[PDB]
Design a protein around this ligand. Structure first.
Ligand SMILES: CCc1cc(NC(=O)Nc2ccc(-c3cnc(Nc4cc(N5C=CN(CC)C=C5)ncn4)s3)cc2)no1
Ligand SMILES: CCc1cc(NC(=O)Nc2ccc(-c3cnc(Nc4cc(N5C=CN(CC)C=C5)ncn4)s3)cc2)no1
Lengths: 301, 297
């Protein structure tokens, strides 16, 4: 009933606080975790970031020399976003930043097990206690990601690229929503398709985003549905055996949708299908998804 | 450590645990020995009267004699005295009226850790996450045993076969006791008039079958060995014979499992000290493992 659903925070018109500033000379860079044309996240050690005595593993997002103005402003707005979100268990959390003394460096938590997609596909490489425990993990991942997106929505942020490749897994099997953004080489990732002037994750995108470039809280919900499908498919790409071409676009428009993964619980597939309503007003909110999944987890115990 | 116990015949039965026998719907047999079995059940109105809950029930077969019936009642009294802990199988209720004793506890949905460890098969991330699980199980069992000794309770048969795994990879210490077929389990060896888990027992316990808090710490060390070796049985290629007993007395100890962190093998080695007074308590082990997990982040 709220007006909060019709408004988003514009990261441009957001403000950076200097509590985060941290001396870049006390960073020891390590292995590169991800890289695209203009950007990279690198694993690093931060000395005295939390307790003045102890070093600490972190992740640092930075740009390559190849980057021009528009990426410099994008990294700034992302640093502002991260600063404005604060802390949630299921989002990558900002820890600090270096905007003086050189190029922008965005300092956040490091997730030690990488992205969920590669986790799922290693599992894919293969009644039963082991299958039950694996199903319990996937239920947990779907719950944690719904809670993290609910938090994002409550702060009026739209993710725009929700997918298993943008979910990180860390100690305790905690999942954190991230956005590799410029630190992903989308040119060589075939999940990103040329559409007009841009390279877009078409198979995760709601029809309003594909045909009208409309992004809203409810188009994030559509992407969440695709994520559940790849989650319960152990990371196979959506609409398998099907290129993104004119036939794909016509098929989404005419109302074809994916069948359930074999080992998706019926109620999780029910959520998926409501996420894929062509009418955004009929999709559940993330707050609603969280409510439904909690019931599923509680009944499972 | 203390050196005192209370025997179960001196503990009470709080009849607030009483549950109507007619509300159990018995399911698959979880484990059975000669005189007793544990079966999965549905209990209606056990925590709140609205709906039901999956539980586990330990009971005796018609074969049981008076001594097994006393033992089950004694087990019930111990679980009542113990109280609740996250890393113990907890009492939920009991049937003692109108029929034989039924002891109702939590059902652990993934079975015992030994079978879980043995069913295993690798990229670095998968290795790391498996190691994180093994450290967690180490910590959780040490916390559970820390709780047992704080209640002056001695387990006597701590082993991976007596650790259960359930939702969230929470481990619960249990004891199938009479619900294990110990004559057909080669990990229990004839010793005098009993079949005993001699490979898990401390040397000092073998003389007169005396169990202590420090011999539980010895068994925990053996447990760590089967944990980090993914469930292989201890002292490979060494049957329990005259030479086994001799070799332990002379000081022979198991080498480290290949995937044990050197700090966890150091714990094992202190657990196997020939002088029980030099072994760590479980409280100290909990503190040591807390540090290891904390640094791993
Ligand atoms: C609210 C949404 C949002 C996001 C955003 N920006 C935003 O997240 N940037 C951003 C910041 C930080 C990160 C990362 C943090 N930790 C990471 N760890 C790994 C580990 C890994 N391994 C692979 C393999 N192995 C052993 C073989 C170990 C590790 N591979 C790849 N990454 S990557 C990602 C993105 N702004 O808003
Ligand atoms: C404080 C120390 C102490 C303990 C004590 N007594 C004491 O523990 N009794 C006692 C009570 C309860 C239990 C059990 C509780 N849940 C259990 N679940 C399973 C599940 C399972 N599965 C196998 C396979 N599959 C695939 C279909 C699924 C499941 N297999 C075996 N068991 S067994 C054990 C013993 N007294 O003192």
């Amino acid at each position: 009933i709220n007006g909060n659903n019709y408004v988003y925070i514009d990261p441009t018109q957001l403000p950076y606080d200097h509590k985060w500033e941290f001396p870049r000379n006390r960073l020891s860079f390590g292995k590169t975790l991800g890289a695209g044309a203009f950007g990279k996240v690198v694993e690093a050690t931060a000395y005295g970031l939390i307790k003045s005595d102890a070093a600490m593993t972190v992740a640092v997002k930075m740009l390559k020399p190849s980057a021009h103005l528009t990426e410099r402003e994008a990294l700034m707005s992302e640093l502002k976003v991260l600063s404005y979100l604060g802390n949630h268990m299921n989002i990558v959390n900002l820890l600090g930043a270096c905007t003086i003394g050189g190029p922008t460096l965005v300092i956040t938590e490091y997730c030690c097990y990488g992205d969920l997609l590669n986790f799922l596909r290693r599992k894919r490489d293969s009644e039963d206690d082991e299958l039950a425990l694996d199903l319990e993990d996937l239920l947990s991942f779907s719950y944690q990601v719904a809670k993290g997106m609910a938090f994002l929505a409550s702060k009026n942020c739209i993710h725009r690229d929700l997918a298993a490749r943008n979910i990180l897994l860390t100690h305790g099997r905690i999942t954190k929503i991230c956005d590799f953004g410029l630190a992903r080489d989308i040119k060589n990732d075939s999940n990103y398709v040329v559409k007009g002037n841009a390279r877009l994750p078409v198979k995760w995108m709601a029809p309003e985003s594909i045909f009208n470039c409309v992004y809203t809280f409810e188009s994030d919900v559509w992407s969440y549905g695709i994520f559940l499908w790849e989650l319960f498919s152990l990371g196979s790409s959506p609409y398998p055996g099907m290129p993104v071409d004119s036939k794909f676009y016509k098929m989404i428009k005419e109302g074809f949708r994916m069948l359930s993964p074999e080992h998706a619980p019926a109620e999780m597939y029910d959520i998926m299908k409501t996420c894929w309503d062509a009418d955004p007003l009929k999709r559940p909110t993330f707050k609603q998804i969280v409510q439904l999944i909690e019931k599923q987890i509680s009944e499972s115990t």
